[model samples]
Target: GPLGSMEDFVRQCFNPMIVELAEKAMKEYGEDPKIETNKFAAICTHLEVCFMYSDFHFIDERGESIIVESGDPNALLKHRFEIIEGRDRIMAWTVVNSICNTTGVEKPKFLPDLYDYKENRFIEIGVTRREVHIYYLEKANKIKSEKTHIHIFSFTGEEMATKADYTLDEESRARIKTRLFTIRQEMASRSLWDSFRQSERG
Candidate 1:
């Protein structure tokens, strides 16, 4: 490219995409110097934010950017919705505890007699044992005759809807029967055994 004049030099250096963004920002806020500078900085900031979009960290196998968004409900949900270890046990507690805070409502007051039906899962607060349920729920409930099991992930998954399609020539029920009995045996173990000790008095 040859620059015959200053106009030619300016044109040679111009990129249409960047130039368009600059033009948009200038027109939007350039009536005020500070506002124009601040808003222009925002456009640059946006390009650098990885969490704002799905293609954030990748260029595809075909060497092109993939900019699909998780979108609407999940767009924001994906930001705070982090589930790890497991969702049924841990994630449910986080959601309930958040509501218990935001509504200016105190936590559930425990009374030995305030019991209704069994609530196997819960968050334990202000106790000698510094542990809380960040996993699934009660032992007996897992054995309940009428219950539906669902896998919860840190982020929503699409393959789950596809039914994880596959088949084996052998028993899926045998796989289930083994894991279930193993878990049922585990219920005997004490959880979060607070070190509340018996006092010996003569």
Candidate 2:
């Protein structure tokens, strides 16, 4: 659970892996190929940390880098093609939240929405205490009883205030369960790595 700047970790611990991936990408994708090379670099950097912590290294070959050339009328088509083929596979799990606790005495609020800096409004589902309910909606239809499943974890106000550094009371324990439940749910939804196939295809 290393929680700090990704740049710091990348430079110190993940440099070797990142370099290898970069070189492989260059070879497979050809020199000066343009589709978001930075995304590949960043993902490799992140994976290095994951490998170190999990003791499970994902072995795979690098794929082609998307290339874009300026002053070319066909650049748009090239860009679109690269976008659809390059990195179409997601290899990592990302958690996005706004944390709101700086002290141990205060309760932490998990912002369930993304905020728009210009509009100054939170986007996505805003879960309030009373309206905190989970439901599974079918993709093709509005039916609730389909193949989809939705699980909800609710907590009392008292439970929500428990701090990692503070003593946990009964109420705090309940809140902790809610937090744990959410984390577990995310973990369950994570996608598995297809590095072997990815490398071969790349």
Candidate 3:
């Protein structure tokens, strides 16, 4: 029951994991000015504080930082391969939503549709009062009888093999029901949300 409702899952489980990951990342690379900006942006992106990205990079040739102004082809090419890396985290929503969506369970929305930091690429969690939709807004496969299939895609929206098929059944839900116990445990004891304001500064 740790991942009880959608709101509960986002607040307690997902947010804590992101915060911890950000903390780890910053602790390791806090000194590098070039990556310091990205560290903060990564935290904000994953925490769902806002849909944002650190598009600036320290150009070694210019010896200064510059923004990859949105839609600038030349600028985008400069840091084309530079994207926020978060593959280490489990992306709890995929599992939770896959099951919930296929099972006809309603999930409340707190996070917005998009929380991305990559240029020309995006990630979304389409949720409304009446429906909890797909992450990419492609709902072609959403149906009552079919099992929900969740996927992980590249920045170019290329399909990755990391796909999951989820079905609505008591045993399926129960087996993985308490999978987030440790995350919840850390959420309660560490008071992860309290220190979130520190990451927002500068």
Candidate 4:
């Protein structure tokens, strides 16, 4: 597993660095020194290779809200992947390839026009990990007006996510684009998502 091996390598290379940063977070949040839990055991390098969600923000088909914590078995959330590629497919593959190898899932196929800037601007690649729907698109936000960077990323599984601003159109059907394990959207879009989900189930 990349996460495990990355932790091991990170520990060997930057033990004090990660410990120092984590302690900084601890002091910021005021964690009790008496309590013992591996909740915070994962190690990371200076913001690289880190995406541990405290809980998933879930809104389902019935307009209900559900909170699946980090440790729950049914939790759809797994490790998250956030990379800055400035939308450059050329720079994204190495990292994306690593993701597949780490998760023990096959790398999704890329079409011939993967490097083009428009028309084929976004990419949709599926995985065999239980009906996943993975995808890519332009970045949503750039903080402090930072330089635009390419972002390389992930896919959603076969299982249909409840709902969260999922977009649908005249095409066939696709589930909520849940790649890289992180995304955002408006508050509603059920009829469209439902239509897509049913067709994909076939």
RMSD values, in order shown: 24.0, 22.2, 18.2, 19.4
lDDT score, candidate 1, position 28: 51
Give every collision pair in model 2: 33-66, 33-67, 34-66, 34-67, 35-66
Lowest lDDT 10-mer window, candidate 2?
79-88
- Which parts of model 3 have CA positions greater than 4 angstroms off? 1-148, 151-165, 168-175, 193-202
* Whole-model lDDT, model 2: 0.27
My TM-score estimates for the predictions, one after another, are 0.17, 0.20, 0.21, 0.20
lDDT of 2 by residue, 157-199 (tens): 2211111221213443344345434422332333211221132
* Candidate 3 local lDDT, 25-100, one digit each (tens): 5665444323454334334234332112223322334543344444643532344222223322234446335534
Once superposed on the true structure, which residue ranges of model 4 sit more than 4 Å away at CA? 1-14, 32-37, 43-202
Better of 1 and 2 by TM-score: 2
Candidate structures ordered by lDDT, highest first: 3, 4, 2, 1
lDDT of 4 by residue, 1-202 (tens): 1122222332444446545555454444566312311212221221222222112334444434444444553434332223322223444566556555775544545411121111112222222212333312222222122212222222232322112212122121222233222211110021222222232221
Q: What overall lDDT goes with each candidate model?
A: 0.26, 0.27, 0.33, 0.29
**For candidate 1, what is the TM-score?**
0.17
